[PDB]
RNA sequence: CAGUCAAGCGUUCAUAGCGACAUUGCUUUUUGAUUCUUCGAUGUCGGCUCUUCCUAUCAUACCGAAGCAGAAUUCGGUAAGCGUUGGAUUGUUCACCCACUAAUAGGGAACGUGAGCUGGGUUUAGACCGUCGUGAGACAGGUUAGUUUUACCCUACUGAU
RNA sequence: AACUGGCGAUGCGGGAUGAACCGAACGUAGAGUUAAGGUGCCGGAAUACACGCUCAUCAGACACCACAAAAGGUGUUAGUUCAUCUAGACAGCCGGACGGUGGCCAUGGAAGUCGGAAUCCGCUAAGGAGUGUGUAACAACUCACCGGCCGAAUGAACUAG
RNA sequence: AAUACUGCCAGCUGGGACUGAGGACUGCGACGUAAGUCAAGGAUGCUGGCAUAAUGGUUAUAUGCCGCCCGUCUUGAAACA
C-alpha cells in the first residue's frame, strides 16, 4: 500500500571503502574488492559518514519491500565475502564401491576424478569454480573444503556439485549415496 | 482477537505489580516444562514463576506503567529470557530460587560497613576535630 | 473423454493404488430432430494406390513420484524428433486367427483419394429354389450371370528455354 | 400459438462482414448543423486532459456480434468480522522443565512416557499421575510453563477487484 | 469587502462564409420643423487585363475514393440455382 519512504540502513565498518558511482558501487574490503551493477534498483544510495549507507526509494511498494528487505541480506552477504569470505566443507557417500575422489588437473581447470562410482567404468570429473578455493579436507574421509566470497560462489558450487551425484536407475529412495554437504564456514574462520 | 487475552492475561499480569512490589528477573530460556511442571509440585511454599513472550508482551510491558510505574522495568529485561514473578520478599530472595532447581533445560547510610564495625555515618566522616583534636587529649592527660 | 467430491476399499492407510453417492465440462472420428443446396443430376461400396494433417503419444529421447532390494513395477512431466510387420478364412468395411517387432497410438483431408485403378458384393432385363399372393405379382429369403468415355483448354504443378 | 416492429415492397449514415440489428428513410441543388457512430496508423477527428486496477511462460481490446464451467490459486488489490492485540506476545534466538510418584499399577518390563486403571497434594518464574522421545524400565533428552531480547503484530472467518 | 453562480441589456468593438433571389411606382416604415434622409415589400458604387480556345466542353491519358454478369424462382441468388 505504498509505504511512503523505503530504505535499507546498513552500518559500514572501517576496513572497507566503497564508491557509489550514482548507483554503481566500488566495494573494497580487507580481503579484497567487490562491485555490483545496482542500476536495477533505482534508489538514492546514502553514505552518512563511513558507518552507514541507506538506499532510498521515495514511496516504495509491497513486493518492492519483499525484495527490498533482502537487498540488505545480500548486501551483508557481500560484506562477509569482501571482508571475511565463506568456507564450506562437503561430503561424499558410497557404501560398497570405494569412489576415488581427486582434483585431477586439466590445465588448472581442476577436475575431480570420481572413480568406482557404484561400479561404473565411467568416470566423473568435476572442474573447480574458481574464486571459491578448495582444499581436501584432510584427516576426514568423504569431506572437502571450499572457500569463496559469495554464498553462491560456494553454495552454487555446492549446489551443482551437489547435482553431480544425482543418482538414478535404482530404487533410490532406498539406494542412498553421493556428494552431500557437511559444513559451511569462513575463509578467515572465526570471521 | 489477542488483545482481550492481553486484557485478561494482563488483567491478572498487569494486576499484581503493586500487589507484589519486588523484582526477580529469571533467566529461563528453552524451558524444560517437564521439570518446570514438577517445580509446581514443589511450589507449595511461596510463589510461582509467571513468564511472557516479552516482545508480544512488549506493548504490554509498555502497558506496565500503571501501578508503580517502576513495573515497566521488564522491557529493560526483554532480551535475555525473561518474564514475571509475584511475591512480597523484597530484593533477592526468589531469583536465587527459580533459576537453580528443576529449571528450564531509595535507601540512605546510617551504617557504614567497614570490617564488621558499627558506624553512625558520622564517625569515619567526622569533622576531623572530634578525634584529630583528641590526639592531644591523653597527651594533655599524659602531661 | 475430462474433471469436482468422497462413503469407503486398499493389513493398517481415503488418496501407493483405488473408489459409494453426487457434481462440472469436452468431442465429433455415433446415433436421434433438421430440410437451407441438388430432381434443365457435383461418378454413392469395398479394396488398391499415394500424400499430408492433428493429438487426446504405441515405441523411441529426457525427467519426476509409489504400498518402486536387484530384477521386475505403477503414476506423472517434457514430449508428434523418428518409427510403429507378414500370411489362413471372409467382396468385404468389419471380424477372427497364425506368426514378428523397440512398438505393432488414435482420428482429419466433400465420411482425402474411379478425365487414378479394379469392380468381388451391391442393383435392369435372363435363370433356379424356399416362403406369400387367385392373379397380375411380392419376398433387407437364398442362389446364377449379366456393356467403367474424354485434357490438344484454364488453373495447379514440373522440367525447359 | 396471442402483442409490437422490419424485410418482402426500401435506399442512405454505425456494427471489418452481415434481409429483418443502431441512426435516419428517398425531388434537383447549394450555404450553415448533427444523429448512429466514433478521434494511436490505415483513420476523418485529440498518443486531449483527470482518478484508479492490472503485467497476463495462455492479459485485454465488448449491443448487434460471432461464447466456458464446477472446482480452485499465501497471485494481486482493498476492505469486513471475531479472538490474542504494544500489557511485547509474535517472529527469531538464549535453559530446565518436578519432590511426594514407578499414583493404583495391569508389573518378567512400564521409572512420566507397552498396557489397564483413577488423574492427586503441592511446587514455582517452571514441572504434566507426567509432553513425547529415549523406553529391559529407563536414565536422560524433551515439550507445555516459566525465565533473556524486539517494538508489533498474532490467530480465525472472510469479502470481492 | 471580494468571488462562484445564474439571468438581463431592445450595452460596445474583430473575423469568416453565403446571397442580391426581385425589378417604373405604390406599401410598410422610421429619421429630420420642414426640406430632406433612411438600411422601409431582396444590390448598389470604384479597377485592371484578355478580347482569345482566354474561359469552358470534349476525347484520350493519368491521378484519390467506391464499384459480385444478366434473366429468373423463392421468404432467401453474385451464388455450388
CA-to-CA distance for B67 and B71, rounded, in angstroms?
7
CATH of the structural domain A86-191, one choice from 3.30.200.20, 3.40.50.2000, 3.40.50.300, 3.90.930.12? 3.90.930.12
To one decimal place, what's the resolution in Å?
Answer: 3.8
Do you know the residue count of chain A?
A: 191
Domains A1-85 and A86-191 share a fold: yes
The CA-atom distances, in angstroms, between B110 and each of A21, B7, B120, B125, B141 are 68, 44, 5, 11, 32
The two beta strands, A180-183 and A89-91, are antiparallel
Sequence spans of domains, chain A: 1-85, 86-191
| Residue B89 three-state SS | coil
Nucleotides of strand C lying closer than 7 angstroms to a protein CB:
63-64, 66-73
CA-to-CA distance for A162 and B58, rounded, in angstroms?
44
Give CA angle at A49 (A45, A52), nearest 5°.
55
Q: CA–C1' span, B26 to D142, in Å?
A: 21
Residue B17 backbone zone (phi > 0: left; psi -120 to 50: alpha; other: beta): alpha
Nucleotides of strand D lying closer than 7 angstroms to a protein CB:
76-79, 82-100, 112, 120-132, 141-155
CA-to-CA distance for B1 and B7, rounded, in angstroms?
11
Is the CATH code 3.90.930.12 the one for domain A1-85? yes
Q: Residue with CA nearest D151 C1'?
A: B58
Name residues 124-183 of chain A with a Cβ under 7 Å from nucleic strand C. 166, 168-175
Asked if residue A88 lies in contact with residue A185, where contact means CB atoms within 8 angstroms, the answer is: yes
Q: CA–C1' span, A172 to C131, in Å?
A: 77
CA-to-CA distance for A9 and A48, rounded, in angstroms?
10
Nearest to A146 by CA among A160, A158, A163: A158
Amino acid at each position: 500500500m505504498k509505504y511512503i519512504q523505503t530504505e535499507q540502513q546498513i552500518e559500514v565498518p572501517e576496513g572497507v571503502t566503497v564508491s557509489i558511482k550514482s548507483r554503481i558501487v566500488k566495494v573494497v574490503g580487507p580481503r579484497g574488492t567487490l562491485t555490483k551493477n545496482l542500476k536495477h534498483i533505482d534508489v538514492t544510495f546514502t553514505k552518512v559518514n563511513n558507518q552507514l549507507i541507506k538506499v532510498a526509494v521515495h514511496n516504495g511498494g509491497r513486493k518492492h519491500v519483499a525484495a527490498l528487505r533482502t537487498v540488505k541480506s545480500l548486501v551483508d552477504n557481500m560484506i562477509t565475502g569482501v571482508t571475511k569470505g565463506y568456507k564450506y566443507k562437503m561430503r561424499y557417500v558410497y557404501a560398497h564401491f570405494p569412489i576415488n575422489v581427486n582434483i585431477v588437473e586439466k590445465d588448472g581447470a581442476k577436475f575431480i576424478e570420481v572413480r568406482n562410482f557404484l561400479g561404473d567404468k565411467k568416470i566423473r570429473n568435476v572442474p573447480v569454480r574458481d574464486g571459491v578455493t578448495i582444499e581436501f579436507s584432510t584427516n576426514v574421509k568423504d569431506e572437502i573444503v571450499l572457500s569463496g566470497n559469495s554464498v553462491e560462489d560456494v553454495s552454487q558450487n555446492a549446489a551443482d556439485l551437489q547435482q553431480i551425484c544425482r543418482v538414478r536407475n535404482k530404487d533410490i529412495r532406498k539406494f542412498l549415496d553421493g556428494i552431500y554437504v557437511s559444513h559451511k564456514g569462513f575463509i578467515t574462520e572465526d570471521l | 482477537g489477542i488483545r482481550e487475552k492481553k486484557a485478561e492475561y494482563f488483567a491478572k499480569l498487569r494486576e499484581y505489580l503493586e500487589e507484589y512490589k519486588s523484582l526477580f528477573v529469571v533467566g529461563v530460556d528453552n524451558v524444560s516444562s517437564q521439570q518446570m511442571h514438577e517445580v509446581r509440585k514443589e511450589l507449595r511454599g511461596r510463589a510461582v514463576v509467571l513468564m511472557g513472550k516479552n516482545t508480544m508482551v512488549r506493548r504490554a510491558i509498555r502497558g506496565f506503567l500503571s501501578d508503580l510505574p517502576d513495573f515497566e522495568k521488564l522491557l529493560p529485561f526483554v532480551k535475555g529470557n525473561v518474564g514475571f514473578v509475584f511475591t512480597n520478599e523484597p530484593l533477592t530472595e526468589i531469583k536465587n530460587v527459580i533459576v537453580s532447581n528443576r529449571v528450564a533445560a531509595g535507601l540512605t547510610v546510617v551504617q557504614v560497613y567497614d570490617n564488621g564495625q558499627v558506624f553512625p555515618x558520622x564517625x569515619x566522616x567526622x569533622x576531623x576535630x572530634x578525634x584529630x583534636x583528641x590526639x592531644x587529649x591523653x597527651x594533655x592527660x599524659x602531661x
